[PDB]
Amino acid sequence: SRYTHFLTQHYDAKPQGRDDRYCESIMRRRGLTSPCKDINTFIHGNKRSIKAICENKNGNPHRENLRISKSSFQVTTCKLHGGSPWPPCQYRATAGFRNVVVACENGLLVHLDQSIFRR
Structure with a gap:
């Protein structure tokens, strides 16, 4: 389920946008917002x-x-x-x-x- 946690945290297959809002949204969407994961990278693609x-x-x-x-x-x-x-x-x-x-x-x-x- 760390894989799931990974996917959830780091996998966004087909991210639409990938702007702040996308982050803010995907971060929210991914339960990565309490607390805000200071930095959370969502790998896209397959x-x-x-x-x-x-x-x-x-x-x-x-x-x-x-x-x-x-x-x-x-x-x-x-x-x-x-x-x-x-x-x-x-x-x-x-x-x-x-x-x-x-x-x-x-x-x-x-x-x-x-x-x-991080940068």
Whole structure:
């Protein structure tokens, strides 16, 4: 369910927009808003492509425990705007197309290394 949590946090297949509002919305939509996940990147494109980050197919092992996708993934990094951890969770969306560091557990994305989307 971390995969689910991952999808929920980091997967937005076909994001419409990927602007702030998208972040704010997807962040809300994803329960990522209490508190506002200070930064929450939603990988777009096929789930499979992200899923694949977990295989040394679309995944390079990365840092410790992490996998950095080989493929780049249209990824919208909702950076919480405002210090406030709390709703309204205003998000700078940062539509970023860049492989995604994830932490694949059992071939399942279980983690998006958000660090890579802090700037």
